[PDB]
mmCIF file of C-alpha atoms in Angstrom:
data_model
loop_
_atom_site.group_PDB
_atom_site.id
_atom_site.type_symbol
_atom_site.label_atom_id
_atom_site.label_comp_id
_atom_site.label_asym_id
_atom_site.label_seq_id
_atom_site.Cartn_x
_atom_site.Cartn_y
_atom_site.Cartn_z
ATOM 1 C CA UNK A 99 3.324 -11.649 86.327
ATOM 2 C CA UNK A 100 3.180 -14.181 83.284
ATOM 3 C CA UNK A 101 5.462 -15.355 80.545
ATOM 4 C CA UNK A 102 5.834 -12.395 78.416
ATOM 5 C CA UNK A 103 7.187 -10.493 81.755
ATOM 6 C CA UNK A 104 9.427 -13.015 82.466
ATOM 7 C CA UNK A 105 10.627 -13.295 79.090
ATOM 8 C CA UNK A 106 10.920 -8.917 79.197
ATOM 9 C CA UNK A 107 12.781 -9.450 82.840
ATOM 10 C CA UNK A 108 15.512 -11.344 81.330
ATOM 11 C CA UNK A 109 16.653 -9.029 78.648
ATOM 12 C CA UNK A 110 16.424 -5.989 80.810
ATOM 13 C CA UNK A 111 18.030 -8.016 83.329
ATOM 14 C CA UNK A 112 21.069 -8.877 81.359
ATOM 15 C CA UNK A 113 20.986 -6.648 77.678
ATOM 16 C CA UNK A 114 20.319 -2.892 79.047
ATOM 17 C CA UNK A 115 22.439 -0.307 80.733
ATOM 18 C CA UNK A 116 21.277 3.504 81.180
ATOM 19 C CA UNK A 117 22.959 5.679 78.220
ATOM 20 C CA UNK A 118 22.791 9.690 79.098
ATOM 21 C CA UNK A 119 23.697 11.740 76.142
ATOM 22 C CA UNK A 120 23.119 15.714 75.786
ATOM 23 C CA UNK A 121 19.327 14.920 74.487
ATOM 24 C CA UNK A 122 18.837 13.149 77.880
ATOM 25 C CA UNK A 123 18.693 9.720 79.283
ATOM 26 C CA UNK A 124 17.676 6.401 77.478
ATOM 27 C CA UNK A 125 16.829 2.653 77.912
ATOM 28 C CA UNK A 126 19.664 1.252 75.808
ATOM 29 C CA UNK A 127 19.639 -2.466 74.174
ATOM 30 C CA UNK A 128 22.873 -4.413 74.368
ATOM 31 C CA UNK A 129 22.846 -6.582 71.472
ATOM 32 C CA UNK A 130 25.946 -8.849 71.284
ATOM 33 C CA UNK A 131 30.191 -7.926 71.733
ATOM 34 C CA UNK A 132 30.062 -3.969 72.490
ATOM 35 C CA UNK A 133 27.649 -3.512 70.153
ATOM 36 C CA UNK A 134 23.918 -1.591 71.477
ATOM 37 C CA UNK A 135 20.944 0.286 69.924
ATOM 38 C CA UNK A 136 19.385 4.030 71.023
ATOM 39 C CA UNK A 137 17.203 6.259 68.838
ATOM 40 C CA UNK A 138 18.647 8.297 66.387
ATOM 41 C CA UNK A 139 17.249 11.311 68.309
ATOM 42 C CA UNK A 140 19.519 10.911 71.200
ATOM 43 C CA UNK A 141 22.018 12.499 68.924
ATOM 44 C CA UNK A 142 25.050 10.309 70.200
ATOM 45 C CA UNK A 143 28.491 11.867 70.254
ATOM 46 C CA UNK A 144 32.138 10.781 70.797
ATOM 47 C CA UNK A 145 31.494 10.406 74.616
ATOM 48 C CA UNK A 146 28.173 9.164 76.337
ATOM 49 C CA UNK A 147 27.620 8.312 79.658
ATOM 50 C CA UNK A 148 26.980 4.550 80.385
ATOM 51 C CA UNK A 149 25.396 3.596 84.001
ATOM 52 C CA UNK A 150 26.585 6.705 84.853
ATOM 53 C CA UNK A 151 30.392 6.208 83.835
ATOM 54 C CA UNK A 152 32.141 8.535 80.794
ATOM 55 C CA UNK A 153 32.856 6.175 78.048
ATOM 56 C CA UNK A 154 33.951 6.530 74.103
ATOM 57 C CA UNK A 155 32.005 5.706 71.574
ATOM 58 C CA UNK A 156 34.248 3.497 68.703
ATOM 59 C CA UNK A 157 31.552 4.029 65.950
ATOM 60 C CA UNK A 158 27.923 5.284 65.662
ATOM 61 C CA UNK A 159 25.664 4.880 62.265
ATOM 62 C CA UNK A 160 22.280 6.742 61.690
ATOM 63 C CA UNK A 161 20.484 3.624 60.133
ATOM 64 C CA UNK A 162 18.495 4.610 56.520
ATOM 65 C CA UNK A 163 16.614 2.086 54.476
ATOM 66 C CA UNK A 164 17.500 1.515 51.296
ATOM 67 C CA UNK A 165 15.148 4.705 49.614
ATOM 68 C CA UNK A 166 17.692 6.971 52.316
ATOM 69 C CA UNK A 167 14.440 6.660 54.696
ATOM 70 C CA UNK A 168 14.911 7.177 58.695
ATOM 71 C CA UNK A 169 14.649 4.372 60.458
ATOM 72 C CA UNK A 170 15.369 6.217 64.159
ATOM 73 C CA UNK A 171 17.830 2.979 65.184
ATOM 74 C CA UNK A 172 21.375 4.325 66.331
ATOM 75 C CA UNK A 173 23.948 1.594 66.313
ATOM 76 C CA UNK A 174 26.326 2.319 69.296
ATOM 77 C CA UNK A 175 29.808 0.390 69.384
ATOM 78 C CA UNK A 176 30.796 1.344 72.801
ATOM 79 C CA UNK A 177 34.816 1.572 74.382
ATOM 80 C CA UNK A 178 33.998 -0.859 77.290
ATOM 81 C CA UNK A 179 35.513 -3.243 79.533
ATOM 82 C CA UNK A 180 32.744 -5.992 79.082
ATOM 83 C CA UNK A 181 30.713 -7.544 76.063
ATOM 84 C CA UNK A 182 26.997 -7.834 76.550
ATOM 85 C CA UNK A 183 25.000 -11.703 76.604
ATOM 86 C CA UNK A 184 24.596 -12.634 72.688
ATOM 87 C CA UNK A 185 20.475 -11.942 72.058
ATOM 88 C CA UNK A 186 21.078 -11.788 68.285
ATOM 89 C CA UNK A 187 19.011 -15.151 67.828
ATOM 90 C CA UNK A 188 16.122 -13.491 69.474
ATOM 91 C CA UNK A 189 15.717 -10.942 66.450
ATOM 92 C CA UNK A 190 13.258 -11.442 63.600
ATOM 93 C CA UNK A 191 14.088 -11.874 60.323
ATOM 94 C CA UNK A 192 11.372 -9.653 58.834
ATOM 95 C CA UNK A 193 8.707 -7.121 59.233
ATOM 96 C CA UNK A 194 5.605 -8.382 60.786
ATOM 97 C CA UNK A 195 2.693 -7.910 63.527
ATOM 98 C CA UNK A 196 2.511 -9.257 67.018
ATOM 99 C CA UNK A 197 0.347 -10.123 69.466
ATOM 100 C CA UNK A 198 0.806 -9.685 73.109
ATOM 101 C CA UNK A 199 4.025 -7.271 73.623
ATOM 102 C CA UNK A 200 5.599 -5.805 76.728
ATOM 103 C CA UNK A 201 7.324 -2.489 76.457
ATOM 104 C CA UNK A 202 10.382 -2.394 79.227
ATOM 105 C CA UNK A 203 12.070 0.729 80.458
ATOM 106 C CA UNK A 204 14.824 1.081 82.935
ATOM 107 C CA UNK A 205 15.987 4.925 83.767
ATOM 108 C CA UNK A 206 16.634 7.100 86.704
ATOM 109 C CA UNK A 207 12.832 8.058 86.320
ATOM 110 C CA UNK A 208 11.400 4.815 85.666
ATOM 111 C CA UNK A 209 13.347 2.064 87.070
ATOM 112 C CA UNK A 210 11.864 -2.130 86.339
ATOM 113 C CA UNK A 211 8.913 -0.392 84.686
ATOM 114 C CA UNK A 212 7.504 -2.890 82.279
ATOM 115 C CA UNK A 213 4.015 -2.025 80.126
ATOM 116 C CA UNK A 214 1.973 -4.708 78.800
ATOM 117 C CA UNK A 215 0.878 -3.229 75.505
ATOM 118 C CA UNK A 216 -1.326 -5.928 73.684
ATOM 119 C CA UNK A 217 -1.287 -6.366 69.790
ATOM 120 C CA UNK A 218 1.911 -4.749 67.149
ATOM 121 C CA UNK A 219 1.013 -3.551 63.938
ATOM 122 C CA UNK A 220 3.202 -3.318 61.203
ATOM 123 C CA UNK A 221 2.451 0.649 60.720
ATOM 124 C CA UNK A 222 5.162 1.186 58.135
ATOM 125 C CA UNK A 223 5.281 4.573 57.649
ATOM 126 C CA UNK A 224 5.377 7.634 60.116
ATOM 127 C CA UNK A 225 6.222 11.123 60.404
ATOM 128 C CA UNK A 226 8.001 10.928 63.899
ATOM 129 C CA UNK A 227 8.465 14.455 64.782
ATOM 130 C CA UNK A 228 8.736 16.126 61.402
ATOM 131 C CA UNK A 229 10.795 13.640 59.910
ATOM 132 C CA UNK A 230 9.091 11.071 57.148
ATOM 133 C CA UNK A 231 10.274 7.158 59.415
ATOM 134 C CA UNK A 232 10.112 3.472 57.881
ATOM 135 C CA UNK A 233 9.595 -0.194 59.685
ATOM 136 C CA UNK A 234 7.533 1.968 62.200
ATOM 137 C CA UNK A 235 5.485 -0.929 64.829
ATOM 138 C CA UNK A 236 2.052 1.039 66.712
ATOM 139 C CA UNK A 237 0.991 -0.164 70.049
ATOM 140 C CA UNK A 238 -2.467 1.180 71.543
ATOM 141 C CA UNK A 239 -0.629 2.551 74.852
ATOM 142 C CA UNK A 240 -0.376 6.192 76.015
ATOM 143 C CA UNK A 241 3.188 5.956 76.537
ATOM 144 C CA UNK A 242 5.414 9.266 77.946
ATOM 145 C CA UNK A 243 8.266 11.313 77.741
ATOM 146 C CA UNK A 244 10.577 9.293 79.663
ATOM 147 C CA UNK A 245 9.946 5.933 77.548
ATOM 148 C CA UNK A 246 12.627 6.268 74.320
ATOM 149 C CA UNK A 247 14.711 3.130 73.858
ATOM 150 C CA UNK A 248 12.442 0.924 75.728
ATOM 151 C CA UNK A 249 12.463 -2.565 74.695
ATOM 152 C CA UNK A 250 9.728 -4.244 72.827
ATOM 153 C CA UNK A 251 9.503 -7.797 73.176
ATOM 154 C CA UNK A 252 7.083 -11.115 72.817
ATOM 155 C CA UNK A 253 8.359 -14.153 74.117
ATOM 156 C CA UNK A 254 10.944 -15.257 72.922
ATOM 157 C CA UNK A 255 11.488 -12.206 70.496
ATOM 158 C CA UNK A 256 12.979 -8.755 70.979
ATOM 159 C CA UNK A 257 11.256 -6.796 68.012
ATOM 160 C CA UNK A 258 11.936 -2.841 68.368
ATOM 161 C CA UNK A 259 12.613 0.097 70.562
ATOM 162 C CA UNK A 260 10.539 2.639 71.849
ATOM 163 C CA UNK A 261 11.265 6.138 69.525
ATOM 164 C CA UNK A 262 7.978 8.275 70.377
ATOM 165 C CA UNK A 263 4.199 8.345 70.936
ATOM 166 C CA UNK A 264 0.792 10.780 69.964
ATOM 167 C CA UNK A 265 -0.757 10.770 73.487
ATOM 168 C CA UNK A 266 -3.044 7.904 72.535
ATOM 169 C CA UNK A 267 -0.523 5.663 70.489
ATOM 170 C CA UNK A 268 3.155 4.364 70.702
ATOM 171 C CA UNK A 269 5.686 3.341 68.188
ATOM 172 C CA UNK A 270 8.789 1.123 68.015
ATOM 173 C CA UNK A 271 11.413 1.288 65.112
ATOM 174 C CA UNK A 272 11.790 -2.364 64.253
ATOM 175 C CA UNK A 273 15.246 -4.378 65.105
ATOM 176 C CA UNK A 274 16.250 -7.094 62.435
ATOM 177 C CA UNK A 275 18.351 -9.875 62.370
ATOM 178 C CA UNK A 276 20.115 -8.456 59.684
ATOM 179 C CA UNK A 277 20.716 -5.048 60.641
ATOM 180 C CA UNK A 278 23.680 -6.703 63.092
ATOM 181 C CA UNK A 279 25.553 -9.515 60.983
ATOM 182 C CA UNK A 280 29.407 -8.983 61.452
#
């Protein structure tokens, strides 16, 4: 509808493919190379199902800060045929607030469903589902079972993925620049 959609419809366009694991099925983020992001609590395995098609997974890491906090960012390098479009210069550099965000989805469920969810804090800390999560972002949306690994963006940045909700909020673990130098 305006420029933060358009700027959403490009990376789901081009940077997301449907991962199913045993937990269910998730928005996934292609980053750059083979290289995506899912939350932790998809509980990724050897095999995972991309678009629908049985594929290995090379390596998987459980990101923790530095304190051995949960962050809820898998790292997914994937045994594929094709590399995703390079978005690693659309990733902040450090933790901050944002106005104006769109949360995008694309699933079996909820296909080209894109949320305009307003103002990003910087929430830091949350207990997400029993377990004690840093670099958390808070959005004032009601957002649903069905939304996990949605993308987060502003335009012109891409600035978390969708890892759970309270009925009246949702929150985003943070992506950083850093977390996906090579």
């Amino acid at each position: 509808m305006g420029p933060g959609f358009d700027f959403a419809q490009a990376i789901m366009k081009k940077n997301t493919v449907i991962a199913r694991t045993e937990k269910g099925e998730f928005t996934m983020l292609g980053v750059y190379d083979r290289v995506a992001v899912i939350p932790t609590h998809a509980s990724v395995g050897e095999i995972i199902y991309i678009n629908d098609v049985e594929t290995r997974v090379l390596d998987a890491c459980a990101l923790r800060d530095l304190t051995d906090t949960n962050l809820e960012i898998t790292i997914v390098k994937l045994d594929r045929n094709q590399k995703f479009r390079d978005i690693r210069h659309f990733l902040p550099r450090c933790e901050d607030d944002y106005n104006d965000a769109v949360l995008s989805v694309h699933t079996s469920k909820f296909p080209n469903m894109y949320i305009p969810v307003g103002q990003v804090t910087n929430y830091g800390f949350l207990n997400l589902g029993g377990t004690p999560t840093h670099r958390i972002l808070m959005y004032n949306f009601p957002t649903r079972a069905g939304q996990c690994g949605g993308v987060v963006t502003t335009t012109g940045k891409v600035i978390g993925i969708h890892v759970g909700g309270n009925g009246a909020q949702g929150f985003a673990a943070m992506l950083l620049h850093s977390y996906f130098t090579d």
